[PDB]
Amino acid sequence: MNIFEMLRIDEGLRLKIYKDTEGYYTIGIGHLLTKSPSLNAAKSELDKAIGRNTNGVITKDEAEKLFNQDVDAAVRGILRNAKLKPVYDSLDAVRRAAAINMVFQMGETGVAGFTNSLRMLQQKRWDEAAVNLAKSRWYNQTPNRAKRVITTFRTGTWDAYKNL
């Protein structure tokens, strides 16, 4: 298990434009195209991302290319964020993956409200952190995925994924 396999489980793989859990146009391995309700706007974003005129369908290779870029972008975003970098630096590699997972799903704007959780994670108060993380829109809207990510933060193991 690693961040790539982990996110592949959580996001799936679809080669045609689909709507994510929030109703937003997405493709590949959870590559958000746009929050716009316009399919044409989404197709434009896709074309721009891939570098060719696609009309809504990509190859597995192309999906994996965007996925690698997105994982990279998530890590780089954490390291450039003053609130996130210290907590990330304080973590072991397994829990770092859980961190990347969250940023991948919600972005930095989505994780802005996790200040108290972040403190508890840096303190390594794993059970308390886990309890706090679940008190969120995130957990309520995507409970099964949140549960996996939280278990990863709680235990520092891949137990929530090793079976999947």
Ligand SMILES: Fc1c(F)c(F)c(Br)c(F)c1F
């Ligand atoms: F949601 C979270 C993040 F987005 C994050 F970057 C880190 Br480090 C965390 F520890 C976390 F809980």
